[PDB]
Symmetry: C3
Subunit: 114 residues, 3 copies
């Protein structure tokens, strides 16, 4: 009866295999968009006190999936397998509780709106 939002923030490649795999476990829709990632790291300044921050901006794909019947853990596990390449920039996955969902066309609320 819970409802969750799965947020995948990752590298722009491999999207198609994801749609295949998410599709197979029950997901029937999702949203996505391009955003930017920024890495931050403490660097030395010349003085003993000094910190200075170095940063790079890269490309990221943000994918959002809402789920209720389809179990979160099956969504996240599938996301790991498919998007794992070991090389840095594989991204992360965030899970959130949802208080409610409303299907606009039908007017249903809860896991039946999905």
């Amino acid at each position: 009866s819970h409802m969750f939002k799965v947020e995948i923030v990752t590298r722009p490649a491999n999207f198609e295999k994801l749609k295949q795999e998410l599709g197979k476990i029950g997901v029937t829709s999702l949203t996505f968009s391009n955003v930017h990632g920024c890495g931050l790291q403490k660097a030395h300044t010349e003085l003993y006190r000094g910190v200075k921050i170095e940063s790079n901006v890269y490309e990221r794909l943000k994918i959002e999936i809402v789920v209720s019947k389809v179990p979160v853990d099956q969504v996240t596990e599938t996301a790991k397998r498919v998007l794992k390449t070991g090389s840095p920039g594989d991204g992360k996955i965030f899970v959130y509780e949802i208080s409610n969902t409303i299907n606009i066309r039908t007017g249903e609320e809860g896991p039946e709106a999905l």
Copy 2:
């Protein structure tokens, strides 16, 4: 005293009537952006075992509204009326709890930051 985020993910039309209606019930600001929606459906392959996923990418408008005094249910109900057209692609509405809000200019926290 609760604070909520209302997330409307919908078809790019009808935005103006929404601003009128949300405005009238008390909303004084919101954010929006264009993202993509992806539908996923299980299709037959030629073999008895085989699943294959078919997908379409459409345009979506993401609208975010934070509320405290103005009741969530008045926001969501208004959103339904205005954006309902019966035809598929009417979109959905997601509700989330917010731990806190901070107005950057004034420095206030909670439903007074809004």
Copy 3:
């Protein structure tokens, strides 16, 4: 052991000083994107009954930071200082609970995925 998402929605300027300050307190990555803000205000119509809504659309920078070890309140306080200019359009900051985080490359969950 909690995990939080800090969402800063603000004016497109001052981003660099932010990266410096967030970097110094422990943040090693964040995401951002350009979205739109819309102000809504009740205006008079000519008739005694009539409300009419006036709205402006401006530019906004959405910045997302996930934190666990690094304390939310140190993130939000730093965000205030740096982005405060008193003039309207300073933006807001929203805090959310996160049920879980997963590092895709390593496979770790919780505050160790960050």
